[PDB]
């Protein structure tokens, strides 16, 4: 029925924090190994890997600005980011999917199809679910506020491995769920299923997190090695990034 001023202001802050974090990532564009125009393979893999890193950094800056997140202990902050990063990477990936070109756009003008993802070294078993999830999110027609809220909710999941203060995390999560209920019921009152449909994407994301482990398994099989940051996060650089 209603959006409190507090709710409105919190949603505004999250949306502002995403935009601010996007700008930072875009500064880092000329830093990335260029997309080649057997070492073109190695170059495409390096390229993709670099975008993943920038995404992780972006996610960290974003969490730091989510009101509440900094009041948790540093080991819980880490445990929540370790678990949620791939999921948020997927959300942010879907968000950059264009259904007309069937391409995903990273940074400003790095446009990639399914085949591009294959040429970068990912396997079909991973790529297909990524694109199926992107299509599914496009059907939902989420706006920037909804995306930001769903990311906040996703970070504050009390069930992740090694959360020492889960009661605190659930309490942080609750207002963000409440705000998303209010926001979507005002945005589309005639569509009462929008809210649970969103929430259920959190379930999809647990599965996708698992498809990703299978991709990491395949990389070991192929003897492809990941940079430190990504090895750490997916099995104290994260620590450093938070400390800044």
């Amino acid at each position: 029925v209603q959006l409190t001023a507090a709710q409105e202001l919190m949603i505004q802050q999250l949306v502002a924090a995403q935009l601010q974090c996007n700008k930072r990532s875009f500064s880092d564009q000329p830093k990335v190994t260029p997309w080649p125009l057997g070492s073109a393979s190695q170059q495409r893999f390096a390229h993709f890997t670099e975008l993943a890193i920038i995404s992780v950094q972006e996610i960290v800056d974003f969490a730091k600005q989510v009101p509440g997140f900094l009041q948790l202990g540093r080991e819980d902050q880490i445990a929540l980011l370790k678990a949620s990063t791939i999921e948020i990477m997927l959300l942010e990936t879907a968000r950059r999917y264009n259904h007309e070109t069937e391409c995903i756009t990273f940074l400003k003008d790095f446009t990639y199809s399914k085949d591009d993802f294959h040429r970068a070294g990912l396997q079909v078993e991973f790529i297909n679910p990524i694109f199926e999830f992107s299509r599914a999110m496009r059907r939902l027609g989420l706006d920037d506020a909804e995306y930001a809220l769903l990311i906040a909710i996703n970070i504050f999941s009390a069930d992740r491995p090694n959360v020492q203060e889960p009661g605190r995390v659930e309490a942080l999560q609750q207002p963000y769920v409440e705000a998303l209920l209010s926001y979507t019921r005002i945005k589309r009152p005639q569509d009462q299923l929008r809210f649970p449909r969103m929430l259920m994407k959190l379930v999809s994301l647990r599965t996708l997190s698992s498809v990703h482990s299978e991709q990491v398994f395949a990389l070991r099989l192929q003897d492809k090695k990941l940079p430190p940051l990504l090895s750490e996060i997916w099995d104290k650089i994260l620590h450093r990034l938070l400390q800044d």
């Binding site: 769920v177 299923l193 449909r197 259920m200 999809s204 647990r206």
Partner: protein, 216 residues
Amino acid sequence: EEMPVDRILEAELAVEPVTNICQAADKQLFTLVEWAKRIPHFSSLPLDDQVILLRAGWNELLIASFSHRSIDVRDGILLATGLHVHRNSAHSAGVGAIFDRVLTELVSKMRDMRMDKTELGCLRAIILFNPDAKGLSNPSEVEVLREKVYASLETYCKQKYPEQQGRFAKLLLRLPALRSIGLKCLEHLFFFKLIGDTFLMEMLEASHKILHRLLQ
């Protein structure tokens, strides 16, 4: 309603160390097929799709059921075979981490919410009607049924627990936790298959004699 909660409640009620869990699972699978038949519109679906949904969901479906059954138990779960499994034994058998997650994320939460049987049946119906299960002839048809369950369950929550405005969401937010827990339990079951029951084994493979027969 097109998916009345009454019929879902009827379906729950109409169904009342390492290897003990596997024995209980084999039995409960038989009950599960009967439960699903009682769920509105499930048997209207094509037969191969009924089979697909039950292969995709049995694991989470059973875990949600024994979790709710174990609300009275303290530091353990009550299997349908009447057997009780305690924390100590679970850790002895190297299955202690997942066991503690079940108690922390499922049982405990169901206890502190006083989750009722209708609420449970709706969650399980949602788990059942999974439009992302591989090889469905018509995913839309299944999505629509899931969405009817969303509508009926929200409605029921507003009518019965009007004092608790966030209750619908609290229910739905057990499902991510249940999905991840599902993935970890399936892991363990796959290990038992590789190391030291007929229906259960049929479910763990990719041919479905028992499931096909039982739904006719």
